[PDB]
Amino acid sequence: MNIFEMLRIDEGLRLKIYKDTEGYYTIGIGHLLTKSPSLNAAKSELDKAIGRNTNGVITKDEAEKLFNQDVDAAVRGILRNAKLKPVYDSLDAVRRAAAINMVFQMGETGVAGFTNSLRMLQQKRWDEAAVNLAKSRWYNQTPNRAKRVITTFRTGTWDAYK
Numbered sequence: 300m301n302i303f304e305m306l307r308i309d310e311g312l313r314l315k316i317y318k319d320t321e322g323y324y325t326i327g328i329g330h331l332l333t334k335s336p337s338l339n340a341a342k343s344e345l346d347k348a349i350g351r352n353t354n355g356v357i358t359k360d361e362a363e364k365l366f367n368q369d370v371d372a373a374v375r376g377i378l379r380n381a382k383l384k385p386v387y388d389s390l391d392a393v394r395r396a397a398a399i400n401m402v403f404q405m406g407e408t409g410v411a412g413f414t415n416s417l418r419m420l421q422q423k424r425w426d427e428a429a430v431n432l433a434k435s436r437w438y439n440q441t442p443n444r445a446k447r448v449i450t451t452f453r454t455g456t457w458d459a460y461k
């Protein structure tokens with residue numbers, strides 16, 4: 300197990316434009332296209348992302364390319380963030396993957412509300428962190444995925460995915 304396999308499980312793979320859990324146009328392995336209700340706006344973003352006129356459909360390779368970029372950007376974003384970086388650096392590799400997962404799903408702006416969970420994570424208060432993480436819109440809206448990510452933070456193992 301690794302961050303790619305983990306996010307692949309959580310996000311799935313769809314080669315045609317679909318709406319994510321929040322109703323937003325998305326493609327591939329959870330690549331958010333736009334929050335705009337306009338399918339045409341989404342198709343435009345897709346074309347921009349892929350570099351060709353896609354007409355809302357991409358290949359597996361193209362999906363994986365976006366995925367690689369998205370994971371890369373997610374981790375880089377964490378390290379570029381003065382508040383997130385120290386927490387990330389304090390973690391072991393398994394929990395780092397859980398961190399990337401959350402950033403991938405929400406963005407750093409979504410992560411901003413998790414300040415208290417982050418503190419407990421840096422403190423390595425795993426059970427407490429886990430409890431605090433679940434007190435969130437995130438958990439309530441995507442409980443199955445949240446439970447997996449939280450278990451990963453609680454245990455530092457891949458048990459929730461293996």
Ligand SMILES: [Cl-]
Nearest residue numbers: 309442443444
């Ligand atoms: Cl599920």
